[PDB]
Write a protein that binds this DNA or RNA. Structure first.
Length: 88
DNA sequence: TTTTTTTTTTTTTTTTTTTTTTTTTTTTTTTTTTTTTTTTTTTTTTTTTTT
């Protein structure tokens, strides 16, 4: 089988297509997440000059990336809400 | 030739200045936080247009 993804831009907004049918960003995203690519992570693209700036980042940004890939960023609000409650 | 007198060089002493070194104090750029504003993007209703 063969899949045809698309994305057309209108005005300011952008619309996504699956199998030549208009879809919303979230479901398209979820399909990609099934395929195995975390677009917000940005761990597999390297532009003109960033191959150096892969190494010299401040460690926090690298931790951010490693937290992003690992599906442990969604559990943030849960964490610090529990934190504030228990410290209170 | 020898004796007497003058002048230049060398070297030591001293005094003033300079340099050094640390220490303590001070005040400043640097670094982080928070906010927060802007701008871009988004949505949804309205408007326009088409069959």
């Amino acid at each position: 089988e063969d899949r045809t993804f698309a994305r057309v831009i209108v005005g300011g907004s952008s619309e996504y297509k699956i199998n030549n049918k208009v879809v919303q960003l979230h479901e398209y995203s979820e399909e990609l997440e099934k395929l195995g690519i975390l677009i917000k992570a940005r761990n597999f693209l390297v532009f003109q000059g960033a191959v150096e700036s892969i190494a010299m980042k401040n460690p926090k940004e690298r931790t951010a990336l490693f937290e992003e890939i690992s599906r442990s960023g969604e559990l943030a609000q849960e964490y610090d809400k529990r934190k504030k409650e228990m410290v209170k």
